[PDB]
Amino acid sequence: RDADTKIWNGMVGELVYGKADIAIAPLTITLVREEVIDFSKPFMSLGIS
Amino acid sequence: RDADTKIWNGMVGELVYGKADIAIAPLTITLVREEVIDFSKPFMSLGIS
Amino acid sequence: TVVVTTILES
Ligand SMILES: NS(=O)(=O)c1cc2c(cc1Cl)N[C@H]([C@H]1C[C@H]3C=C[C@@H]1C3)NS2(=O)=O
Incomplete structure (x- = not known):
């Protein structure tokens, strides 16, 4: 935004x-992206590193 | 089912x-559960161990 | 009042 x-x-x-x-x-x-558009289930998992 | x-x-x-x-x-x-009911984004990450 | 079905798994 x-x-x-x-x-x-x-x-x-x-x-x-x-x-x-x-x-x-x-x-x-x-969350802020979820409010505007649509996401499918996560194809990959990750973390901030 | x-x-x-x-x-x-x-x-x-x-x-x-x-x-x-x-x-x-x-x-x-x-997949078969998603066809008949709607899920949220998953709250827990798990796997075969 | 919402019905939350669940299962007893530790
Ligand atoms: N190991 S990984 O991060 O490449 C990875 C991560 C994930 C995979 C598959 C792989 Cl290979 N599938 C799951 C999917 C299975 C169902 C549960 C969450 C989505 C729908 N998403 S995930 O948990 O984000």
């Missing part, structure tokens, strides 16, 4: 604003 | 049949 313009940048923004039909990508399932 | 009678039995069978509103339980996410 951009600083006070409330615009998603990057791949998430391409999903929200209609640019992309799907994002098969290393995109983390996060 | 029963092979002979094609009915779901268990906690999932209780959810399909309307007796129970939700299942906050240790229930594994699988």
Whole structure:
């Protein structure tokens, strides 16, 4: 989320604003992303390291 | 899901049949369960050990 | 009032 313009940048923004039909990508399932778009079940598991 | 009678039995069978509103339980996410009921994102990561 | 079905597994 951009600083006070409330615009998603990057791949998430391409999903929200209609640019992309799907994002098969290393995109983390996060709450703020979950509110705007749809995630399937996690294909891979990871941690901040 | 029963092979002979094609009915779901268990906690999932209780959810399909309307007796129970939700299942906050240790229930594994699988394909056949996902077809008949809807799961959240998984809360626990487990594997064969 | 919501029915939370569950199983007894430790
Ligand atoms: N070992 S891993 O991180 O490559 C990995 C991680 C995961 C896999 C499969 C692999 Cl190979 N599948 C699971 C999936 C099975 C069901 C439970 C969660 C999704 C749907 N997601 S996961 O738990 O995120």
